[PDB]
Amino acid sequence: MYDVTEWKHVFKLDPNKDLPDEQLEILCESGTDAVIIGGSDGVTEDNVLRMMSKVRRFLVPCVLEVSAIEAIVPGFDLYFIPSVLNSKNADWIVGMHQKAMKEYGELMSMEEIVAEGYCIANPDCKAAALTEADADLNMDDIVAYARVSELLQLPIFYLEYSGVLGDIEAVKKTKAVLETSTLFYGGGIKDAETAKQYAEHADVIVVGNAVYEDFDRALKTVAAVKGE
Amino acid sequence: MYDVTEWKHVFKLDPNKDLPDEQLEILCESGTDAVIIGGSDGVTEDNVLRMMSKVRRFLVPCVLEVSAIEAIVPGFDLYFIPSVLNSKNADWIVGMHQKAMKEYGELMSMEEIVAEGYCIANPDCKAAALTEADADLNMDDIVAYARVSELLQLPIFYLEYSGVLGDIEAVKKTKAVLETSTLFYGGGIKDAETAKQYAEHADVIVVGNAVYEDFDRALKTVAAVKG
Numbered sequence: 001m002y003d004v005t006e007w008k009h010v011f012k013l014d015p016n017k018d019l020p021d022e023q024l025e026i027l028c029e030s031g032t033d034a035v036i037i038g039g040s041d042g043v044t045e046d047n048v049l050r051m052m053s054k055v056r057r058f059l060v061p062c063v064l065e066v067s068a069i070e071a072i073v074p075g076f077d078l079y080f081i082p083s084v085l086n087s088k089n090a091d092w093i094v095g096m097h098q099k100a101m102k103e104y105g106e107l108m109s110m111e112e113i114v115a116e117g118y119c120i121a122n123p124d125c126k127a128a129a130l131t132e133a134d135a136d137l138n139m140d141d142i143v144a145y146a147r148v149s150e151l152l153q154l155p156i157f158y159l160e161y162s163g164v165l166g167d168i169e170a171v172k173k174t175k176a177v178l179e180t181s182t183l184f185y186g187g188g189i190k191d192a193e194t195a196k197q198y199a200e201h202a203d204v205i206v207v208g209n210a211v212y213e214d215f216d217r218a219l220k221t222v223a224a225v226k227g228e
Numbered sequence: 229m230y231d232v233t234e235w236k237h238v239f240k241l242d243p244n245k246d247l248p249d250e251q252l253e254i255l256c257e258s259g260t261d262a263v264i265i266g267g268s269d270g271v272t273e274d275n276v277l278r279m280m281s282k283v284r285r286f287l288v289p290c291v292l293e294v295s296a297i298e299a300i301v302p303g304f305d306l307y308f309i310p311s312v313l314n315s316k317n318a319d320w321i322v323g324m325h326q327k328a329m330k331e332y333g334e335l336m337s338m339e340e341i342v343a344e345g346y347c348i349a350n351p352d353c354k355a356a357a358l359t360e361a362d363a364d365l366n367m368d369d370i371v372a373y374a375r376v377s378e379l380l381q382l383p384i385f386y387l388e389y390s391g392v393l394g395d396i397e398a399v400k401k402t403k404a405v406l407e408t409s410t411l412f413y414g415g416g417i418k419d420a421e422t423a424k425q426y427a428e429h430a431d432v433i434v435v436g437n438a439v440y441e442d443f444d445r446a447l448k449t450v451a452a453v454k455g
């Protein structure tokens with residue numbers, strides 16, 4: 001009974017890192033619209049399983065972003081399955097999902113899945129390297145990828161700048177072309193000011209790295225976009 | 229836009245070939261549910277333009293299957309843009325859609341576009357070679373591509389065997405997993421008996437080059453499928 005078109009803020013947590021249990025409880029009770037567990041590069045199923053067990057008690061939706069088939073774990077409310085639209089490797093577009101349907105077809109059928117169209121626009125991050133993304137893009141290239149996602153009707157279009165602040169103009173123009181898709185933006189949001197700035201254009205802002213860098217400051221990103 | 233979930237039979241024409249006498253008009257007035265202009269790599273914008281000018285005048289929906297952005301031509305009722313799901317080359321999955329939107333965004337917006345998830349299951353054909361398709365597939369691979377097609381929201385899953393008939397069991401198993409999209413089957417259908425056989429599982433059967441080889445026999449496939 002989830003609806004990402006109602007969301008405004010999500011925290012994305014890296015199971016490859018460690019967060020104190022009190023901080024994890026606080027993020028879950030923060031008012032964020034979802035807590036997303038990033039099942040990515042170097043991720044292990046054991047860490048995803050421990051995380052699931054800790055966040056599932058809260059009312060907030062818990063989501064697993066499936067970046068590696070081996071790290072899939074039952075128990076989450078939603079499963080986000082990325083397709084890296086600007087990847088030069090078919091494995092990151094279709095390949096890996098076909099292997100998953102072939103090997104875990106029954107599991108996939110029992111879960112609530114949401115496809116994400118990713119556009120990785122920071123050429124210097126671990127994700128661009130892993131996925132061989134053609135990540136050095138002009139604004140018109142980004143807008144064209146968003147149009148591809150809007151055509152395929154993927155429910156989410158995720159503009160990913162990882163650790164850097166992306167060009168706000170690119171967020172605005174991407175949002176301009178999206179009619180049916182929900183625009184998720186991630187990239188350098190570390191405090192209330194940046195969160196507000198980007199929440200003016202993105203439908204949902206994603207705060208992740210910041211949680212491990214300056215927790216109190218990152219926490220304020222929720223009130224920044226959902227508060228009075 | 230015309231509703232592909234109500235179709236049962238479509239003819240797919242190669243714009244590089246030409247039907248004699250009034251055969252094109254007979255085909256377009258036959259009862260088929262759509263006339264799709266496809267082609268095999270050597271497709272040119274000029275040949276697509278001439279074909280458009282001929283088929284547009286009939287009530288039957290005319291569709292351009294866009295296999296090259298250089299050959300997009302205005303004037304069709306619907307445009308199908310394939311994503312070759314089993315391609316080893318990203319350009320055949322998302323690359324072209326991106327080019328079309330980057331180069332012809334305004335045109336794309338004015339046209340009715342349908343994404344089509346293709347699975348080329350014949351490794352020995354021009355289409356597999358052109359699209360770098362991993363086409364030597366077991367039935368479980370095909371079924372898994374059909375599950376992905378839906379994951380990606382695609383309205384059409386097109387199981388393609390090009391010039392030969394594909395495994396009927398693959399058609400049946402694919403139809404079984406498609407819960408929300410329409411299954412098009414193309415490959416080697418040239419007469420009524422075979423058209424009827426594959427129509428028991430596919431949602432839409434595509435009859436292609438048989439129209440050039442033996443037109444009268446291929447024309448009978450419409451009634452075979454639709455009664």
Ligand SMILES: [Cl-]
Binds near residue numbers: 070
């Ligand atoms: Cl593991």
Ligand SMILES: [Cl-]
Binds near residue numbers: 229230231
């Ligand atoms: Cl209709």
Ligand SMILES: [Cl-]
Binds near residue numbers: 245247252
């Ligand atoms: Cl003709």
Ligand SMILES: [Cl-]
Binds near residue numbers: 256285286287288
């Ligand atoms: Cl007519």
Ligand SMILES: [Cl-]
Binds near residue numbers: 415436
């Ligand atoms: Cl044929």
Ligand SMILES: [Mg+2]
Binds near residue numbers: 005006007203
């Ligand atoms: Mg909303």
Ligand SMILES: [Mg+2]
Binds near residue numbers: 045046
């Ligand atoms: Mg284990």
Ligand SMILES: [Mg+2]
Binds near residue numbers: 060
């Ligand atoms: Mg819960």
Ligand SMILES: [Mg+2]
Binds near residue numbers: 202203204
């Ligand atoms: Mg919104």
Ligand SMILES: [Mg+2]
Binds near residue numbers: 233234235431
């Ligand atoms: Mg029907």
Ligand SMILES: [Mg+2]
Binds near residue numbers: 273274
């Ligand atoms: Mg010309």
Ligand SMILES: [Mg+2]
Binds near residue numbers: 288290
């Ligand atoms: Mg017409």
Ligand SMILES: [Mg+2]
Binds near residue numbers: 284286287305
């Ligand atoms: Mg008309």
Ligand SMILES: [Mg+2]
Binds near residue numbers: 284
């Ligand atoms: Mg017209």
Ligand SMILES: [Mg+2]
Binds near residue numbers: 430431
């Ligand atoms: Mg049907």
